[PDB]
Amino acid sequence: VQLQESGPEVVRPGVSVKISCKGSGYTFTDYPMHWVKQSHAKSLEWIGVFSTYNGNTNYNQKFKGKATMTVDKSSSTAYMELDRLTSEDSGIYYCAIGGELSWFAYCGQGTTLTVSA
Amino acid sequence: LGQCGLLGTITGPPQCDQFLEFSADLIIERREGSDVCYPGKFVNEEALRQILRESGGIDKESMGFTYNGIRTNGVTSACRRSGSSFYAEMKWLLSNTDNAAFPQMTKSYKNTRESPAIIVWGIHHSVSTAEQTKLYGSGNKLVTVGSSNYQQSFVPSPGARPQVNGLSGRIDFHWLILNPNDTVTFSFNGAFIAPDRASFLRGKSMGIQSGVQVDANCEGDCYHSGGTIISNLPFQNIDSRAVGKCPRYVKQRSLLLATGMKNVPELFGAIAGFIENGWEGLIDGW
Amino acid sequence: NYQQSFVPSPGARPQVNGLSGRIDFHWLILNPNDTVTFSFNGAFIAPDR
Amino acid sequence: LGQCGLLGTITGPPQCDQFLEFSADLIIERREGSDVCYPGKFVNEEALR
Amino acid sequence: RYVKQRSLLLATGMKNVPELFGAIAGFIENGWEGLIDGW
Amino acid sequence: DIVMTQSPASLAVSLGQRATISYRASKSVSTSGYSYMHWNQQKPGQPPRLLIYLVSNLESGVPARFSGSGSGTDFTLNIHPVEEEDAATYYCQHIRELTRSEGGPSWNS
Amino acid sequence: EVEKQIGNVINWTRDSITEVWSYNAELLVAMENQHTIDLADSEMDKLYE
Ligand SMILES: *[C@@H]1O[C@H](CO)[C@@H](O)[C@H](O)[C@H]1NC(C)=O
């Protein structure tokens, strides 16, 4: 399953940018879709607030009152808007539809978002 | 069953792992038989205890919920096999990250067989509302079990209690019955201990609570808690809960039935009548 | 006599002929010169007879 | 019991203050016997009775 | 009142002896076929 | 959060070899006869990909010449013959017990 | 832990059924004893006359 992100790459710290990952092949079903942050100097963290197939929300620890992940069913792409931006958060955002006991294999190549003023 | 009990044959605590999917024409429950290893009881458990010891066995199928954004191995230090283990046929669906959240899951299972299922599922009565922020996540917890017949929408009781051998959190958990071509949805966003092996039935059996040992060489059908009543006699003063194909309980310990005539030793009037004496020297006839 | 304070179960289920929402509903018995109050702010299917 | 009832022997409403901690080989409940003074009943009260 | 014996036949006549006192199946050793007016 | 130790957190290796490198677990990671520890390959210039689930039961889609191994606490995969396209960064993340946390990483060239 | 009311109901029912059968068992045997001595004294008459 090949799948592509989309989102504007020129954005300021402190304003909102949206992420849009097209889920090819099938819709948001009993397998929902998560997200992963890439940091500088090649380290990861599972920042991805994800939306299940019933419309709820599960943030990271540091990022609870911080974002919103909800599902849209018409475009096979979950809805998210990333406000509050900071130049430390420059990274490539890899969407991933999960299966959780194979792995997050339905994975993305990332649209490189550079967050700087 | 030994350390296993009746209601453990569905749930499979580590004292029941050799009885998970059994077959019987007689189950035998023991006084030491814990139905539980992370402590508690069932809900309407005397109703469920009269089905499972009339089932014959417990045949199973996988349900195959592909749990996602989840964990599977909720293990605790009172269900040991080698180390941290759990019930063989349930899963603590606890969250991805510690205090983050645990979203809604809607999980369906269509019964597709000839027989009525006997499902079971779990709600987690934790000790406090600080464990159910690190196990599952902030917010209220709903487990909604709506079949075609039912609608229940359960909720836990996160209060402290005196300890049964190590922990101040409980679990108590519930059960329905399906009919062929039904479905069961499990809507839940926390505190839910799903099944993974839907349970079926096998036919005829009976079931006894007792405390004495097993004689596989003798045969009988009247099995109370202190043995087996084997005779052809219609009344017993042994136990008033003698289940099986038993005789009928009374309270007179001696009901002597006059399988011979009167003694007159040395309603018609010759037995204790004008024939005034019995005889000692007849053993061939009456 | 009573005090019950009911609450619904908004969960999904397999369908009985068309819908995935249920209703299940309750009943009391009055005695002469009693009263029944119905306090409700949603999800309530009142009687009229 | 009089104005006291059966389930008032635990709870002690003011009609039961001479029966709070009683001793009997026969208790006798009365038709006028309120088990309550701030009104209500118990839950699964026929089991406790 | 429900029972499980499908046939509980209740002896609305006496014994047949065809060709607790002892004359029904006793010293009166034979029934009679040709009486329909009385017992 | 679980801090899984990678040691060595830097190596690169030769052809046809077998390597035993550990992301080691510091918490209670015994259950079910197994651990829920998946791995992923990450090639520099490619998106990552699953390779192992449920240590014995590998996927199809990679050649099966990777061998995730272990029974106990601290786990370690094994490789047999290494080829040219092994030059990648072999992360993983944790899924077995709460919480999720990624690897070190370690290198492979 | 059987339920308090229905356990009293079962004990009301069982001890009734216990008093049903034990009255029946005492009456049956005493009826059968009197009948057995009736059918023991009867074939004195059937033998002696
Ligand atoms: C029922 O009676 C038995 C003995 O006859 C007793 O052991 C049991 O506790 C009783 N149960 C209740 C609920 O009264």
Side-chain angles (χ1 to χ4, degrees), chain C residues 10-40:
Chain C
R13 188 72 184 178
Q15 292 177 354
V16 176
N17 62 18
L19 274 300
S20 295
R22 304 281 86 82
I23 55 172
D24 287 326
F25 54 90
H26 307 84
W27 63 275
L28 64 89
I29 290 172
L30 284 182
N31 294 316
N33 284 316
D34 285 337
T35 187
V36 170
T37 304
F38 290 111
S39 181
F40 62 98

Short mmCIF file of all heavy atoms in Angstrom, two decimals, chain C residues 10-40:
data_model
loop_
_atom_site.label_atom_id
_atom_site.label_comp_id
_atom_site.label_asym_id
_atom_site.label_seq_id
_atom_site.Cartn_x
_atom_site.Cartn_y
_atom_site.Cartn_z
N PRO C 10 -25.19 4.36 24.55
CA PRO C 10 -25.03 4.71 23.13
C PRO C 10 -23.90 3.95 22.44
O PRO C 10 -22.90 4.53 22.01
CB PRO C 10 -24.76 6.22 23.20
CG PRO C 10 -24.10 6.41 24.50
CD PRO C 10 -24.71 5.42 25.45
N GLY C 11 -24.08 2.64 22.30
CA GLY C 11 -23.10 1.79 21.66
C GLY C 11 -23.68 1.08 20.44
O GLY C 11 -24.89 0.88 20.32
N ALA C 12 -22.78 0.71 19.53
CA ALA C 12 -23.15 0.05 18.30
C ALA C 12 -23.52 -1.41 18.56
O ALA C 12 -23.12 -2.00 19.56
CB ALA C 12 -22.02 0.13 17.28
N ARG C 13 -24.28 -1.97 17.64
CA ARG C 13 -24.73 -3.35 17.74
C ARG C 13 -25.04 -3.85 16.33
O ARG C 13 -25.30 -3.03 15.44
CB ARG C 13 -25.98 -3.46 18.65
CG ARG C 13 -26.45 -4.88 19.00
CD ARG C 13 -25.51 -5.56 19.98
NE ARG C 13 -25.90 -6.93 20.26
CZ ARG C 13 -25.22 -7.75 21.06
NH1 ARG C 13 -24.14 -7.31 21.68
NH2 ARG C 13 -25.64 -8.99 21.27
N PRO C 14 -24.93 -5.16 16.08
CA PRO C 14 -25.60 -5.75 14.91
C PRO C 14 -27.08 -5.43 14.83
O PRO C 14 -27.75 -5.21 15.84
CB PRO C 14 -25.36 -7.25 15.10
CG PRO C 14 -24.02 -7.29 15.76
CD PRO C 14 -23.97 -6.10 16.68
N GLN C 15 -27.61 -5.43 13.60
CA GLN C 15 -28.89 -4.81 13.31
C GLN C 15 -30.03 -5.81 13.41
O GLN C 15 -29.96 -6.91 12.86
CB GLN C 15 -28.86 -4.20 11.92
CG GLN C 15 -27.95 -3.02 11.79
CD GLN C 15 -27.88 -2.49 10.39
OE1 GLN C 15 -28.43 -3.08 9.46
NE2 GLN C 15 -27.21 -1.36 10.22
N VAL C 16 -31.09 -5.41 14.10
CA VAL C 16 -32.41 -6.00 13.91
C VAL C 16 -33.12 -5.13 12.88
O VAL C 16 -33.42 -3.97 13.15
CB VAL C 16 -33.20 -6.10 15.22
CG1 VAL C 16 -34.60 -6.63 14.94
CG2 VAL C 16 -32.48 -6.99 16.20
N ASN C 17 -33.29 -5.69 11.67
CA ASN C 17 -33.99 -5.21 10.48
C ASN C 17 -33.95 -3.70 10.22
O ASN C 17 -34.99 -3.07 10.00
CB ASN C 17 -35.43 -5.76 10.44
CG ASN C 17 -36.32 -5.33 11.62
OD1 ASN C 17 -36.05 -4.38 12.34
ND2 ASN C 17 -37.40 -6.08 11.81
N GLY C 18 -32.75 -3.11 10.20
CA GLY C 18 -32.59 -1.80 9.61
C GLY C 18 -31.82 -0.75 10.39
O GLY C 18 -31.24 0.16 9.79
N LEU C 19 -31.81 -0.85 11.72
CA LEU C 19 -31.24 0.19 12.56
C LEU C 19 -30.27 -0.41 13.58
O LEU C 19 -30.45 -1.54 14.03
CB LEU C 19 -32.33 0.97 13.32
CG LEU C 19 -33.07 2.18 12.72
CD1 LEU C 19 -32.11 3.30 12.36
CD2 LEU C 19 -33.96 1.80 11.53
N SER C 20 -29.26 0.38 13.94
CA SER C 20 -28.28 -0.01 14.95
C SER C 20 -28.50 0.70 16.28
O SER C 20 -27.69 0.55 17.20
CB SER C 20 -26.86 0.25 14.45
OG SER C 20 -26.52 -0.57 13.35
N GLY C 21 -29.55 1.50 16.40
CA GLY C 21 -29.97 2.02 17.69
C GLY C 21 -31.11 1.18 18.24
O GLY C 21 -31.95 0.68 17.50
N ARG C 22 -31.11 1.00 19.56
CA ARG C 22 -32.13 0.24 20.25
C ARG C 22 -33.04 1.20 21.01
O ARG C 22 -32.79 2.40 21.06
CB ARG C 22 -31.50 -0.76 21.22
CG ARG C 22 -30.49 -1.76 20.65
CD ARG C 22 -31.13 -2.93 19.91
NE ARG C 22 -31.41 -2.65 18.51
CZ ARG C 22 -30.51 -2.74 17.54
NH1 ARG C 22 -29.27 -3.11 17.81
NH2 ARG C 22 -30.86 -2.46 16.29
N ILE C 23 -34.10 0.65 21.60
CA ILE C 23 -34.69 1.17 22.82
C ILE C 23 -35.04 -0.03 23.70
O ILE C 23 -35.42 -1.09 23.20
CB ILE C 23 -35.95 2.06 22.64
CG1 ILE C 23 -37.06 1.35 21.86
CG2 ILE C 23 -35.64 3.44 22.08
CD1 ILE C 23 -38.35 2.12 21.83
N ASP C 24 -34.88 0.15 25.00
CA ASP C 24 -35.40 -0.75 26.00
C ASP C 24 -35.99 0.13 27.08
O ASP C 24 -35.45 1.20 27.37
CB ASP C 24 -34.30 -1.66 26.60
CG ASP C 24 -33.84 -2.75 25.64
OD1 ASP C 24 -34.67 -3.25 24.86
OD2 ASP C 24 -32.64 -3.10 25.67
N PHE C 25 -37.12 -0.28 27.65
CA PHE C 25 -37.79 0.69 28.50
C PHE C 25 -38.62 0.05 29.61
O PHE C 25 -39.03 -1.11 29.54
CB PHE C 25 -38.60 1.67 27.66
CG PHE C 25 -39.57 1.07 26.70
CD1 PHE C 25 -40.87 0.82 27.08
CD2 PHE C 25 -39.21 0.86 25.38
CE1 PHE C 25 -41.78 0.32 26.19
CE2 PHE C 25 -40.12 0.35 24.47
CZ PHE C 25 -41.40 0.08 24.88
N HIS C 26 -38.89 0.88 30.63
CA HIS C 26 -39.11 0.54 32.03
C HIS C 26 -40.53 0.89 32.45
O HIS C 26 -41.26 1.58 31.73
CB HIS C 26 -38.14 1.31 32.91
CG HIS C 26 -36.71 1.16 32.50
ND1 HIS C 26 -36.13 1.94 31.52
CD2 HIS C 26 -35.73 0.35 32.97
CE1 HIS C 26 -34.86 1.59 31.38
NE2 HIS C 26 -34.59 0.63 32.25
N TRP C 27 -40.90 0.48 33.66
CA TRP C 27 -42.29 0.61 34.09
C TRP C 27 -42.38 0.55 35.62
O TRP C 27 -41.66 -0.22 36.25
CB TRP C 27 -43.12 -0.50 33.46
CG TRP C 27 -42.71 -1.85 33.88
CD1 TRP C 27 -41.71 -2.61 33.35
CD2 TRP C 27 -43.28 -2.62 34.94
NE1 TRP C 27 -41.63 -3.81 34.01
CE2 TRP C 27 -42.58 -3.83 34.99
CE3 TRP C 27 -44.32 -2.40 35.84
CZ2 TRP C 27 -42.89 -4.83 35.91
CZ3 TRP C 27 -44.63 -3.38 36.75
CH2 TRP C 27 -43.92 -4.58 36.78
N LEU C 28 -43.24 1.40 36.20
CA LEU C 28 -43.56 1.31 37.63
C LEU C 28 -45.06 1.03 37.81
O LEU C 28 -45.79 0.82 36.84
CB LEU C 28 -43.13 2.57 38.38
CG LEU C 28 -43.61 4.02 38.24
CD1 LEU C 28 -44.81 4.32 39.12
CD2 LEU C 28 -42.47 4.97 38.55
N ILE C 29 -45.50 1.02 39.06
CA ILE C 29 -46.90 0.88 39.43
C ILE C 29 -47.22 1.94 40.47
O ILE C 29 -46.52 2.04 41.49
CB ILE C 29 -47.23 -0.53 39.97
CG1 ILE C 29 -47.18 -1.57 38.86
CG2 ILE C 29 -48.59 -0.57 40.65
CD1 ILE C 29 -47.30 -2.97 39.38
N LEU C 30 -48.27 2.72 40.23
CA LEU C 30 -48.76 3.67 41.21
C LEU C 30 -49.86 3.07 42.08
O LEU C 30 -50.45 2.04 41.76
CB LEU C 30 -49.28 4.94 40.56
CG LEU C 30 -48.18 5.87 40.08
CD1 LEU C 30 -48.78 7.11 39.50
CD2 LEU C 30 -47.33 6.19 41.27
N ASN C 31 -50.09 3.73 43.20
CA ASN C 31 -51.19 3.50 44.12
C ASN C 31 -52.03 4.77 44.17
O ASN C 31 -51.56 5.84 43.76
CB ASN C 31 -50.62 3.16 45.51
CG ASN C 31 -49.90 1.84 45.52
OD1 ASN C 31 -50.37 0.85 44.94
ND2 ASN C 31 -48.74 1.81 46.15
N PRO C 32 -53.31 4.69 44.59
CA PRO C 32 -54.18 5.88 44.56
C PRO C 32 -53.66 7.05 45.39
O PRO C 32 -53.08 6.88 46.46
CB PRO C 32 -55.50 5.35 45.13
CG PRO C 32 -55.51 3.93 44.75
CD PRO C 32 -54.09 3.47 44.85
N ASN C 33 -53.83 8.25 44.81
CA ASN C 33 -53.39 9.56 45.31
C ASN C 33 -51.87 9.70 45.34
O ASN C 33 -51.36 10.57 46.05
CB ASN C 33 -53.97 9.90 46.69
CG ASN C 33 -55.43 10.32 46.63
OD1 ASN C 33 -55.82 11.09 45.75
ND2 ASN C 33 -56.23 9.81 47.55
N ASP C 34 -51.14 8.91 44.56
CA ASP C 34 -49.70 9.10 44.47
C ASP C 34 -49.34 10.21 43.50
O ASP C 34 -50.19 11.00 43.10
CB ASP C 34 -48.98 7.83 44.05
CG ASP C 34 -48.88 6.81 45.15
OD1 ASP C 34 -48.97 7.19 46.34
OD2 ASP C 34 -48.67 5.63 44.82
N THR C 35 -48.06 10.29 43.14
CA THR C 35 -47.62 11.12 42.03
C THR C 35 -46.41 10.44 41.40
O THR C 35 -45.78 9.57 42.00
CB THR C 35 -47.30 12.55 42.48
OG1 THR C 35 -47.03 13.38 41.35
CG2 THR C 35 -46.10 12.56 43.39
N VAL C 36 -46.11 10.82 40.15
CA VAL C 36 -44.85 10.47 39.50
C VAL C 36 -44.29 11.72 38.86
O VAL C 36 -44.94 12.35 38.03
CB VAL C 36 -45.00 9.38 38.43
CG1 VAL C 36 -43.72 9.25 37.64
CG2 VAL C 36 -45.25 8.08 39.05
N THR C 37 -43.07 12.07 39.23
CA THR C 37 -42.34 13.11 38.54
C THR C 37 -41.42 12.47 37.50
O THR C 37 -40.86 11.40 37.73
CB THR C 37 -41.56 13.95 39.54
OG1 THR C 37 -42.47 14.46 40.52
CG2 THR C 37 -40.89 15.12 38.89
N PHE C 38 -41.32 13.10 36.33
CA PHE C 38 -40.35 12.71 35.31
C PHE C 38 -39.42 13.89 35.08
O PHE C 38 -39.77 14.83 34.36
CB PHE C 38 -41.01 12.28 34.00
CG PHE C 38 -41.74 10.98 34.08
CD1 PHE C 38 -43.12 10.94 33.99
CD2 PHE C 38 -41.05 9.79 34.16
CE1 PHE C 38 -43.79 9.73 34.02
CE2 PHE C 38 -41.72 8.58 34.21
CZ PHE C 38 -43.09 8.56 34.13
N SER C 39 -38.25 13.86 35.70
CA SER C 39 -37.20 14.82 35.41
C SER C 39 -36.32 14.24 34.31
O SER C 39 -35.82 13.12 34.44
CB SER C 39 -36.39 15.12 36.67
OG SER C 39 -35.37 16.06 36.40
N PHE C 40 -36.14 15.00 33.23
CA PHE C 40 -35.42 14.50 32.07
C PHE C 40 -34.95 15.67 31.22
O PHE C 40 -35.68 16.64 31.03
CB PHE C 40 -36.29 13.54 31.24
CG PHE C 40 -37.53 14.16 30.66
CD1 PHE C 40 -37.55 14.61 29.34
CD2 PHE C 40 -38.70 14.24 31.40
CE1 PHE C 40 -38.69 15.16 28.80
CE2 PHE C 40 -39.84 14.79 30.87
CZ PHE C 40 -39.84 15.25 29.57
#
